[PDB]
Amino acid sequence: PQSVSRAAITAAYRRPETEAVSMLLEQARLPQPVAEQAHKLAYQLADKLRNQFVTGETIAEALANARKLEEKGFRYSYDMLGEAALTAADAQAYMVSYQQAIHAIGKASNGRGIYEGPGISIKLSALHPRYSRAQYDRVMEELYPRLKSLTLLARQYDIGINIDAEESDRLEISLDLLEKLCFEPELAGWNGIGFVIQAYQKRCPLVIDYLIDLATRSRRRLMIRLVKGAYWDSEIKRAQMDGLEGYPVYTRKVYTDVSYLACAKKLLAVPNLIYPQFATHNAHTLAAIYQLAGQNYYPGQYEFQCLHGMGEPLYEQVTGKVADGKLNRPCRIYAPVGTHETLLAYLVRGANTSFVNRIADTSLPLDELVADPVTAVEKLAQQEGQTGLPHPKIPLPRD
Numbered sequence: 494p495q496s497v498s499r500a501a502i503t504a505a506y507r508r509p510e511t512e513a514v515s516m517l518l519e520q521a522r523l524p525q526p527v528a529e530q531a532h533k534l535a536y537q538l539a540d541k542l543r544n545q546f547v548t549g550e551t552i553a554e555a556l557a558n559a560r561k562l563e564e565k566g567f568r569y570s571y572d573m574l575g576e577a578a579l580t581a582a583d584a585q586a587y588m589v590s591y592q593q594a595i596h597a598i599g600k601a602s603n604g605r606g607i608y609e610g611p612g613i614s615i616k617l618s619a620l621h622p623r624y625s626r627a628q629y630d631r632v633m634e635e636l637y638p639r640l641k642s643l644t645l646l647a648r649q650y651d652i653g654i655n656i657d658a659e660e661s662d663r664l665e666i667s668l669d670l671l672e673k674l675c676f677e678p679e680l681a682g683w684n685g686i687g688f689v690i691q692a693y694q695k696r697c698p699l700v701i702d703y704l705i706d707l708a709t710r711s712r713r714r715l716m717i718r719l720v721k722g723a724y725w726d727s728e729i730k731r732a733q734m735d736g737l738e739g740y741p742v743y744t745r746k747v748y749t750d751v752s753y754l755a756c757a758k759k760l761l762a763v764p765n766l767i768y769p770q771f772a773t774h775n776a777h778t779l780a781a782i783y784q785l786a787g788q789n790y791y792p793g794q795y796e797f798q799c800l801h802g803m804g805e806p807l808y809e810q811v812t813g814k815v816a817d818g819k820l821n822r823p824c825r826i827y828a829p830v831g832t833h834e835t836l837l838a839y840l841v842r843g844a845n846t847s848f849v850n851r852i853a854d855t856s857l858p859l860d861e862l863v864a865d866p867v868t869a870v871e872k873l874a875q876q877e878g879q880t881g882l883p884h885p886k887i888p889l890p891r892d
């Protein structure tokens with residue numbers, strides 16, 4: 494059974510890009526004081542940037558190697574990576590591996606809790622055979638009890654447990670799993686449940702409204718990892734192959750940047766209901782959130798996140814003491830754990846390296862690198878005669 498907010502999500506599924514962008518544009522606005530500040534900071538972070546991906550083969554080794562950056566203010570979220578589960582036995586192997594990881598992480602956490610201590614990150618596609626194409630009934634029957642069991646194990650140790658986000662046609666299933674989990678009696682009062690949402694989806698703002706509703710109804714604070722989205726190519730491909738009325742995601746990168754900012758504001762507005770975790774390696778996005786979060790930061794207000802191997806050089810400037818030239822804002826490192834061989838997944842994941850490749854391009858000016866998304870959309874509208882038009886090289890599926 495659904496709440497009104499929950500039922501509201503469907504409509505936005507693949508709504509016209511011009512409409513979606515129009516609704517959101519001004520919501521992504523940086524106040525003038527904020528915008529100038531964010532630009533200056535963004536500039537100095539990217540400029541400083543213009544001047545290894547596996548944390549450990551086992552969780553014990555990952556934990557051993559974590560002190561170095563934890564001492565500097567970083568936090569960690571560990572994920573036992575590997576291929577999607579194909580059989581129930583694969584799923585169970587992953588289950589066993591997650592359980593063992595939680596005992597180890599919990600022990601190392603040693604009562605640090607869900608904010609300051611490390612946490613676990615899980616992938617639903619690891620926990621159910623052929624999840625990408627699995628049926629609702631079977632997921633609820635077989636996946637849910639695993640998710641609940643892992644979550645209770647994390648509560649026992651008081652560590653955060655985060656649910657990943659995958660392809661857009663998995664969204665609704667994942668939300669049902671989240672809703673049921675939030676009403677478990679044994680989880681009452683505990684706020685360590687975490688969930689990923691993807692800004693590149695047109696449904697994202699509506700998903701946020703539902704999450705706010707859910708946190709309210711279930712009397713908790715949700716830990717929400719806001720990312721841009723990792724599956725853009727395949728989202729575009731699948732909609733074309735299926736001949737849909739439109740895309741579930743934006744087709745221009747700047748639109749996703751606009752969406753991320755508008756969504757970040759919505760998250761920050763409700764400190765009682767949400768602990769926002771801003772996962773980005775983009776220097777402007779970081780700087781903007783930093784200013785948007787306002788004055789009088791406190792540790793439990795929010796955190797940044799990044800991928801191991803991609804984010805440290807940026808966040809070395811952010812996490813740490815102000816006396817040392819840092820910003821004193823925590824960053825949680827997402828740390829893949831497993832045999833280095835199984836790192837092939839990393840290589841498997843252009844779209845997702847937009848900013849990091851652009852900052853590597855020393856022929857690209859820093860000022861265009863850290864340009865305001867909203868301002869850029871207005872410029873595009875000026876040139877093209879209308880706001881929020883789809884990428885010119887990507888027509889609708891039925892074209």
Ligand SMILES: *N1c2cc(C)c(C)cc2N(C[C@H](O)[C@H](O)[C@H](O)COP(=O)(O)OP(=O)(O)OC[C@H]2O[C@@H](n3cnc4c(N)ncnc43)[C@H](O)[C@@H]2O)c2[nH]c(=O)[nH]c(=O)c21
Pocket residue numbers: 656657658659689691693720721722723724725742743744745746747748749772773774775778798799800826827844845846847848849
């Ligand atoms: N897991 C997860 C967990 C953590 C801790 C992090 C930090 C990230 C992920 N995650 C990956 C994430 O979704 C992004 O792919 C990644 O963080 C890179 O984004 P960012 O650092 O913000 O750099 P950017 O500014 O260059 O953005 C790139 C981003 O823009 C979108 N894009 C690209 N091209 C586009 C076009 N033409 N039109 C619209 N949008 C376009 C893409 O989203 C691209 O990624 C991750 N991702 C998940 O989906 N789910 C997860 O659980 C995690």
